[PDB]
Design a protein around this ligand. Sequence first.
Ligand SMILES: Cc1ccc(C(=O)N(CCCN)[C@@H](c2oc3cc(Cl)ccc3c(=O)c2Cc2ccccc2)C(C)C)cc1
Ligand SMILES: Nc1ncnc2c1ncn2[C@@H]1O[C@H](COP(=O)(O)OP(=O)(O)O)[C@@H](O)[C@H]1O
Ligand SMILES: [Cl-]
Ligand SMILES: [Cl-]
Ligand SMILES: [Cl-]
Ligand SMILES: [Cl-]
Ligand SMILES: [Cl-]
Length: 347
Amino acid sequence: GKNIQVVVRCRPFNLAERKASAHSIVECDPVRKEVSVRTGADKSSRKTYTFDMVFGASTKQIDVYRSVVCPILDEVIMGYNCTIFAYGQTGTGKTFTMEGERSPNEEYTWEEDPLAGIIPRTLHQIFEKLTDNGTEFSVKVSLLEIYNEELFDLLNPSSDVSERLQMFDDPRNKRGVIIKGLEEITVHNKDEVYQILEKGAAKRTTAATLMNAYSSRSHSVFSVTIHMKETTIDGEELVKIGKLNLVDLAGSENIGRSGAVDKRAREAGNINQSLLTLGRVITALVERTPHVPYRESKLTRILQDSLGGRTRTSIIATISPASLNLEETLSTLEYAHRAKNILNKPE
Ligand SMILES: Cc1ccc(C(=O)N(CCCN)[C@@H](c2oc3cc(Cl)ccc3c(=O)c2Cc2ccccc2)C(C)C)cc1
Ligand SMILES: Nc1ncnc2c1ncn2[C@@H]1O[C@H](COP(=O)(O)OP(=O)(O)O)[C@@H](O)[C@H]1O
Ligand SMILES: [Cl-]
Ligand SMILES: [Cl-]
Ligand SMILES: [Cl-]
Ligand SMILES: [Cl-]
Ligand SMILES: [Cl-]
């Protein structure tokens, strides 16, 4: 029940906002666990939302990682597949958290830097934690980009100038999907990752257009796979496998409020499907429904094994308080509410 979780993150509106003239009545409160926004004459109305964990504008980037990650890794560290994703409108800090951030000016080491997102924060933990554990481990890192009816591998530009790749299901496992030439190179050195990592930004960064939706319209999935072998004085050798998936998603503004002027139509479309496929797939899992349409979305199909195998999943929604975008906040809220169902606390 508990393992599936929903997190919504709220921060103070950007300083640059004034030119827009956007007004933010939006609020985020952790202690209450509920976020309410004034509907605004008829402005007394305030939206009531309930989540187990709700990030605030004050809240540190580190605090979120410990809350949702610092917990998943141990299960994942044990050798259980887990998925952490950020969905919602665009530029809500998902990439900064997901791809991390670097403090302005000359700065402490990246692990040292406060700014960095889950991947940098998530990545920093694995090497250090293992050292304390002392178990032998091998690291494989892979990155993916989602374009409709197309798949790309960030790590290697080799063998391809820049072409879409087909995906193949595997007979040995009915659930399993196999992609040829998929590039995951296990990390020889943890320090080494940045040089290897540096390529991912450049290749994705250069090709974003036509495209034209890159970052904003592309989920972009980065996955880390761990192989662990630990000994024992009583031991003996024990083998465990850990897979962690970290991803970024398109903006949540498109999704309809329930019984919205537009819900299916607003959320409707081929581009729409990955988000829509996720809600039914994600929504179905919470319910326990016999049939889950993981198949409909390519991203969903790949994710099935981690979800399908015993796993823990955390679902994240990001919002902006400012008046200037009406659509993004509602779509995130409907998606979060729809995806996760919780009774609303009444104060
Ligand atoms: C503390 C911190 C956090 C994020 C960044 C950052 O902005 N990155 C670029 C992507 C957009 N935020 C990071 C980053 O860059 C990548 C570049 C390529 Cl080509 C492929 C993958 C990455 C990637 O996963 C990250 C995430 C990251 C990891 C550790 C520290 C910081 C960020 C740093 C390695 C600079 C820098 C420092
Ligand atoms: N809490 C925050 N405080 C200050 N700036 C933030 C915060 N969250 C996000 N940002 C800013 O927003 C930008 C990141 O948005 P981005 O990573 O492009 O998201 P997306 O890829 O979803 O568009 C960065 O310039 C970062 O400085
Ligand atoms: Cl807020
Ligand atoms: Cl809020
Ligand atoms: Cl912890
Ligand atoms: Cl722990
Ligand atoms: Cl198939």
